[PDB]
Ligand binder design. Structure first.
Ligand SMILES: *[C@@H]1O[C@H](CO)[C@@H](O[C@@H]2O[C@H](CO)[C@@H](O[C@H]3O[C@H](CO)[C@@H](O)[C@H](O)[C@@H]3O)[C@H](O)[C@H]2NC(C)=O)[C@H](O)[C@H]1NC(C)=O
Ligand SMILES: *[C@@H]1O[C@H](CO)[C@@H](O[C@@H]2O[C@H](CO)[C@@H](O[C@H]3O[C@H](CO)[C@@H](O)[C@H](O)[C@@H]3O)[C@H](O)[C@H]2NC(C)=O)[C@H](O)[C@H]1NC(C)=O
Ligand SMILES: *[C@@H]1O[C@H](CO)[C@@H](O[C@@H]2O[C@H](CO)[C@@H](O)[C@H](O)[C@H]2NC(C)=O)[C@H](O)[C@H]1NC(C)=O
Ligand SMILES: *[C@@H]1O[C@H](CO)[C@@H](O[C@@H]2O[C@H](CO)[C@@H](O)[C@H](O)[C@H]2NC(C)=O)[C@H](O)[C@H]1NC(C)=O
Ligand SMILES: *[C@@H]1O[C@H](CO)[C@@H](O[C@@H]2O[C@H](CO)[C@@H](O)[C@H](O)[C@H]2NC(C)=O)[C@H](O)[C@H]1NC(C)=O
Ligand SMILES: *[C@@H]1O[C@H](CO)[C@@H](O)[C@H](O)[C@H]1NC(C)=O
Lengths: 167, 168
């Protein structure tokens, strides 16, 4: 099946996509890496010290780079801790879930959101490679070669607790 | 009997323990955390880009903070150096295996060691909590509250690739 190899927690600065409406469309350009992996980028609004309710989920293959699939719910936010509630459409933040239109999973920052939370947004990419090999415990040398662009990104919120290995 | 929850790789600066002896005694003050955990601090000698052959092993309970048990061998060193190359008693480095009375597991830096080695020493604490609950995959909120002092320590040698959790 798809045996996980680990997760990379990197930070990407969003790029403004010129829009037709009054809203701000933000895109976090993902490196075109052709390896078996899952890409979950969390939209962190630094100014409000909170995150958006849903995260953009992408998937990569050995013959295709990260391609958008769906906008899954944010289960483990960077801040959270029940001190505050995640930012929703009501708060002026929405991720489009369209696969037909060229957008997705780009963040929509409507004028309804705090002035100016859009410029404060930062991505927390959770790149998690996998392999068909059950005997592989970490990414091999040629896989780390292909993932160079992701590996060279700055670390963002990488946890202190290293999970235990299968015993 | 004791299910692991993970490991914290933190750095601690050693404190010089006064002694009327020619040797230097270094202590890495561990936070008094009352949780079920194992504490393995590695004595890294930064100047020589090497570590000491043995590590001080401590154990904590919900009724007692980290208490020293024994000086176990360094299996996974920092600089990736092969075992046998690690700084031994011959090189002027020794960890006290004494349970009674005190001064264990404190590092002894004898005068025959390279000048400036003692001041260069840094600890690599490997704090690994463990629960009796088989259905617990990560430390709970009240456990992370108690481990605040360890969590606020600076990271030291923790890898960039986070291994996958108990899933597949
Ligand atoms: C990248 O991930 C792919 C899964 O998303 C994976 O492809 C799958 O590989 C398996 C074999 O590992 C194929 O299944 C074949 O294996 C059985 C025995 O278990 C044979 O009897 C059959 O030939 C069977 O088809 C899947 O067909 C395949 N799935 C698809 C369509 O992708 C890749 O192997 C992964 N690549 C790397 C390099 O990690
Ligand atoms: C902290 O770790 C302890 C283990 O190092 C653990 O204590 C052990 O808990 C089990 C039950 O979960 C006890 O039960 C066993 O022994 C009794 C007789 O004493 C039998 O009746 C039981 O059937 C079973 O075999 C152990 O006695 C106990 N061991 C000791 C002495 O510590 C704690 O539960 C852990 N605490 C937390 C909060 O994580
Ligand atoms: C984004 O769109 C997909 C549809 O492609 C949604 O996925 C559905 O999820 C529900 C359960 O939550 C299932 O009942 C459906 O079968 C799924 N559809 C399929 C076939 O993929 C997804 O929930 C949407 N995300 C958002 C923004 O809520
Ligand atoms: C702030 O603005 C957005 C739109 O600019 C609002 O979102 C819409 O909410 C209505 C509720 O009736 C829904 O029908 C739409 O699906 C939402 N629009 C889209 C496509 O995003 C949001 O409710 C506003 N928040 C405030 C302050 O009321
Ligand atoms: C450096 O000095 C220490 C003592 O100051 C030496 O350690 C002793 O080595 C002998 C080997 O026969 C043993 O009896 C003991 O394990 C050591 N004594 C203690 C308790 O420290 C060490 O051998 C010296 N290294 C050099 C350069 O010869
Ligand atoms: C320290 O003492 C313990 C006693 O349990 C012993 O098992 C161990 O071999 C000693 N450590 C070393 C390697 O000197």
């Amino acid at each position: 099946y798809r045996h996980p190899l680990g997760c990379y927690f990197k930070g990407i600065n969003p790029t403004k996509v010129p829009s037709s409406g009054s809203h701000t469309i933000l895109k976090c350009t993902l490196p075109v890496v052709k390896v078996n992996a899952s890409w979950t980028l969390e939209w962190v609004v630094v100014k409000l010290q909170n995150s958006v309710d849903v995260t953009s989920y992408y998937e990569s293959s050995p013959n295709s780079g990260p391609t958008f699939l769906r906008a899954i719910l944010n289960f483990t936010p960077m801040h959270g801790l029940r001190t505050k509630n995640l930012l929703k459409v009501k708060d002026g933040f929405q991720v489009d879930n369209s696969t037909d239109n060229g957008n997705g999973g780009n963040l929509y920052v409507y004028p309804n959101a705090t002035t100016g939370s859009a410029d404060s947004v930062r991505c927390r990419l959770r790149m998690c490679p996998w392999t068909s090999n059950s005997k592989m415990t970490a990414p091999d040398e040629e896989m780390l070669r292909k993932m160079s662009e992701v590996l060279n990104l700055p670390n963002y919120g990488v946890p202190d607790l290293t999970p235990p290995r299968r015993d």
